Amino acid sequence: DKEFTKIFRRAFASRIFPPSVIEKLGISHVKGLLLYGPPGTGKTLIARKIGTMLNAKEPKIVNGPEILSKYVGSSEENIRNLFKDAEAEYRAKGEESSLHIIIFDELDSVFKQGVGDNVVNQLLAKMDGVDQLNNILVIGMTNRKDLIDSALLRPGRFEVQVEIHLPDEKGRLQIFDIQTKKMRENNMMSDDVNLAELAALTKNFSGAEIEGLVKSASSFAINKTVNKDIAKLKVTREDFLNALNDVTPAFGISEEDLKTCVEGGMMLYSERVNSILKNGARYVRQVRESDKSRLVSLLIHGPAGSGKTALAAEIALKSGFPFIRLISPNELSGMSESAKIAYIDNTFRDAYKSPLNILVIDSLETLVDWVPIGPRFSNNILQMLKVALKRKPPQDRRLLIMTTTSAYSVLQQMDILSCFDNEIAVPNMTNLDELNNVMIESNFLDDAGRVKVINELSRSCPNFNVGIKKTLTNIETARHDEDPVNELVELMTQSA
Amino acid sequence: AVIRPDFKFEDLGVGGLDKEFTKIFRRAFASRIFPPSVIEKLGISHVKGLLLYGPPGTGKTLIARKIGTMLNAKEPKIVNGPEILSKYVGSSEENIRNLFKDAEAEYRAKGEESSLHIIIFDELDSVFKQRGSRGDGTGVGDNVVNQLLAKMDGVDQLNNILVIGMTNRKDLIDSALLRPGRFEVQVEIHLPDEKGRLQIFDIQTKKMRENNMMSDDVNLAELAALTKNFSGAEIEGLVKSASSFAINKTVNIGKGATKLNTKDIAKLKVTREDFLNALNDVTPAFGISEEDLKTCVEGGMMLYSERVNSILKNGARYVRQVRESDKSRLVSLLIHGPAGSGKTALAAEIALKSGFPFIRLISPNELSGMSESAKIAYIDNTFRDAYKSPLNILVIDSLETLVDWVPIGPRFSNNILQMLKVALKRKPPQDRRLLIMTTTSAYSVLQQMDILSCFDNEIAVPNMTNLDELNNVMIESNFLDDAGRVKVINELSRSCPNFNVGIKKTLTNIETARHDEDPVNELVELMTQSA
Ligand SMILES: Nc1ncnc2c1ncn2[C@@H]1O[C@H](COP(=O)(O)OP(=O)(O)OP(=O)(O)O)[C@@H](O)[C@H]1O
Ligand SMILES: Nc1ncnc2c1ncn2[C@@H]1O[C@H](COP(=O)(O)OP(=O)(O)OP(=O)(O)O)[C@@H](O)[C@H]1O
Ligand SMILES: Nc1ncnc2c1ncn2[C@@H]1O[C@H](COP(=O)(O)OP(=O)(O)O)[C@@H](O)[C@H]1O
């Protein structure tokens, strides 16, 4: 609706005025409008509806690829022939000519940077200069904006750019109702099926995909019958659930990546965990509330393997903000440097389009390509990050940044520590009490073994000092060989 | 109607691809089983386009050939790709829109009662390439796509046509035809599994076994086991190649004249060794692995000491763990020790005994000669491949050499190192498991790299030192007689009791002493200098 208001208010206001005033002042009316967006947004639908809603002349619909002509010079003949009606109508009357609209589906197909050049020549010739036809509106629609010929991308031509987006939640439910009507009405639908959950499953689907899913879900019911009881042909939930495997989108999401990081779960083996969580909650409310603190930076540092990614991910999931994202070395693997810089800069720029945002950075030093014998590292990306972490967002938008590291000293060498506002230390557990909590939580052994393990450990290793991750993997591997204590204690004593 | 009442698919040649047959039947002809009234009542349209594709020689042409006779279908119209084109202007286009008249006439004639007309385009990619190729020439290579596209999308309500297009390379197809309403369903045909392999052998050897022309000795199960990566075409080639051997025993081609033993013509019979010779003749074209690991342990084991046994037991323990638990989806192990002690053979042996579906090794041998980017890409593709099968074992050989370490700079390739560092910590996709074994000889260097933190457990392989183990390996190698093996050890006991060599050097010295002078004066001499 916002685009609907913008295009109407700004572009289509000058036609409203009495023609003599326009003729006399010399105000020049906007000629070119570019609708763009991903496939399936319905650019053709909006292009059709714009003509009808403005009470304009009947649109001339022509396909982009169909412009290609067999005969030499006939493509130019067609292009010039397109304008004859509008030219003659303006000649007869002038300012009183009605609004002619021409839509060229898939403009980029033929308008790339030699039929495809002579068409551009003819269009540009008829379009500007000798002609002052303000009664013609040409609407260009393309899925790929970068392919547009640069000869047309200039002021005066396609001044106004408007974008489009896929079907959101309610609209998807409504279209689902539209397709399902015929099948639901005829009492061949089991009441067990809920349409809203099928929307909840289909997040990145376009209408054609929806039709495909409908056919496949009906199809499993088809198969159930065929290896005269046709009355019992009913479409059930299970067919819909099964048919989801066939169709596939072309989208991507990283919210899942933040949910898998905490797969191992929390254990609250110590109070300091709760203290850290409290501090994180305090900082998120602080960003939420204060209108001046528009940028907050936090460091999470500690011994390797103590467990730092999971904590930040948990805090971020607890925040409940609209926009959440993670940057990790995993995504960047295999890329060249010039690509990694651009990827990082993208991930920063896309975060400035929402009132409240949280970003998490994983294993900073690993991104920086650090190795100590040289010491060797990539300076460019380091600089990129250093600049980026001090950028204030645009007005009225707020960021919360957490980065995790394990090489505090190296960062100290780099003098980058001035970038940050506050540090949090996460020490690994050292007291056998926490081992007991972890042990009961993991239901490793009965009470007796869990009492004997502590006794055994007390007489060999008082200061325990191992990361939680190691403890978990040690428990898992000790589960199999010899569940009794005669494995486990030895293993930790080796890993002490 | 749409399938013959007398049919069960058991009789047909196609075997080993049964899931694909059910998918095609369910998604293609299912909607044309009921009376028409139901479909409109349900508001479902019919499917129009099909695509089949796979590597060369997988059986697609066999399907396309037999389906017409299979399902009581109107004789499908077969046109190979490059014949649609013609010399004269407009001839190709009219040729394309010359196929659809009969079905369309029947459609106007008889509405929805019209029977099903099937036309199959062998070799779809030949003419329907990308329609933005460019070239500034005769445009007949584009308007054909437009003609088919017009007659297939703007069909004017023709709903009784199914086109089946077969190809070997989807990528070359013009993208304009891969969209809903136009070749919606795509079916992949991949290489057969083992059971389908046996099916194919059985189908091929039917007529053979019926006419008592095969010896009872032959065992199909063994053959199916042997042919690791053979497609159906390669199997047929194997069959006839094995036959040629039996054929070439009575007729002695070239040598002598034509001597046909008319009696043995009736006793012609194939035997197992002929099949073995045939296996040696034909080779597959896919390969991947399962040979490099076997050759990596060619020298075999000797079990000269308990240490070998203990290490093997530990490896068995670990493979059991990764096989059983579902929470442990990734395990990494290091094998380190003195140079030449013998590390690679042990890991290969463990992997071979594991018997998992999926195994490969990475060695400097393969990567030789490539540019850095190529090496990065190669490793990445190998890893990405490993993330596929449910269970996976991967072996990494001589890590230091993969990273190009030389101690004078010290110079090394950082990119490869850091790529490996990130990669060895990557948990595979959901519900997949992976087991990594890496071997090295320069522990301290790795420690300086500070990359020691992504290894769950480390295994030492001390070289042998006690003269007993030397006697064991020597008796196994059969270097000399009994008295010789005794006297040499008695001499070595006092010549140099303290002893540190390894394993490889020992075998080398044994062979050299065998060649020149298997007396003491060579073997003991060299053994003494080496230690
Ligand atoms: N309070 C806690 N603090 C840290 N880890 C915890 C806590 N409670 C539970 N865990 C568990 O500790 C495990 C070990 O941490 P994790 O697997 O994230 O390794 P890590 O230390 O982040 O790795 P890295 O060495 O790269 O920093 C987590 O998988 C998580 O399930
Ligand atoms: N128990 C054993 N342990 C190791 N090798 C054995 C054993 N029994 C027999 N062998 C033989 O010893 C040889 C070991 O050589 P291998 O190539 O593994 O040495 P390596 O140390 O890996 O080589 P490099 O020094 O180049 O790294 C093989 O021929 C193997 O068959
Ligand atoms: N189930 C099968 N799978 C693969 N090939 C088979 C099978 N049964 C028989 N064959 C033999 O393999 C060949 C089929 O190859 P074909 O499909 O023509 O390869 P292409 O993929 O190049 O079309 C025929 O010679 C046929 O006799």
Curated annotation (Swiss-Prot), chain A:
<dbReference type="GO" id="GO:0005794">
    <property type="term" value="C:Golgi apparatus"/>
</dbReference>
<feature type="binding site">
    <location>
        <begin position="37"/>
        <end position="44"/>
    </location>
    <ligand>
        <name>ATP</name>
    </ligand>
</feature>
<dbReference type="GO" id="GO:0042144">
    <property type="term" value="P:vacuole fusion, non-autophagic"/>
</dbReference>
<keyword id="KW-0653">Protein transport</keyword>
<keyword id="KW-0931">ER-Golgi transport</keyword>
<keyword id="KW-0677">Repeat</keyword>
<dbReference type="GO" id="GO:0043332">
    <property type="term" value="C:mating projection tip"/>
</dbReference>
<keyword id="KW-0597">Phosphoprotein</keyword>
<dbReference type="GO" id="GO:0005829">
    <property type="term" value="C:cytosol"/>
</dbReference>
<dbReference type="GO" id="GO:0005795">
    <property type="term" value="C:Golgi stack"/>
</dbReference>
<protein>
    <recommendedName>
        <fullName>Vesicular-fusion protein SEC18</fullName>
    </recommendedName>
</protein>
<dbReference type="GO" id="GO:0048219">
    <property type="term" value="P:inter-Golgi cisterna vesicle-mediated transport"/>
</dbReference>
<dbReference type="GO" id="GO:0006888">
    <property type="term" value="P:endoplasmic reticulum to Golgi vesicle-mediated transport"/>
</dbReference>
<dbReference type="GO" id="GO:0000149">
    <property type="term" value="F:SNARE binding"/>
</dbReference>
<dbReference type="GO" id="GO:0016236">
    <property type="term" value="P:macroautophagy"/>
</dbReference>
<dbReference type="GO" id="GO:0070300">
    <property type="term" value="F:phosphatidic acid binding"/>
</dbReference>
<dbReference type="GO" id="GO:0048280">
    <property type="term" value="P:vesicle fusion with Golgi apparatus"/>
</dbReference>
<keyword id="KW-0067">ATP-binding</keyword>
<keyword id="KW-0547">Nucleotide-binding</keyword>
<feature type="binding site">
    <location>
        <begin position="302"/>
        <end position="309"/>
    </location>
    <ligand>
        <name>ATP</name>
    </ligand>
</feature>
<keyword id="KW-0813">Transport</keyword>
<dbReference type="GO" id="GO:0005524">
    <property type="term" value="F:ATP binding"/>
</dbReference>
<comment type="similarity">
    <text>Belongs to the AAA ATPase family.</text>
</comment>
<comment type="function">
    <text>Required for vesicle-mediated transport. Catalyzes the fusion of transport vesicles within the Golgi cisternae. Is also required for transport from the endoplasmic reticulum to the Golgi stack. Seems to function as a fusion protein required for the delivery of cargo proteins to all compartments of the Golgi stack independent of vesicle origin.</text>
</comment>
<dbReference type="GO" id="GO:0006891">
    <property type="term" value="P:intra-Golgi vesicle-mediated transport"/>
</dbReference>
<dbReference type="GO" id="GO:0000045">
    <property type="term" value="P:autophagosome assembly"/>
</dbReference>
<comment type="subunit">
    <text>Homohexamer. Binds to SEC17.</text>
</comment>
<dbReference type="GO" id="GO:0035494">
    <property type="term" value="P:SNARE complex disassembly"/>
</dbReference>
<keyword id="KW-0963">Cytoplasm</keyword>
<dbReference type="GO" id="GO:0016887">
    <property type="term" value="F:ATP hydrolysis activity"/>
</dbReference>
<dbReference type="GO" id="GO:0043001">
    <property type="term" value="P:Golgi to plasma membrane protein transport"/>
</dbReference>
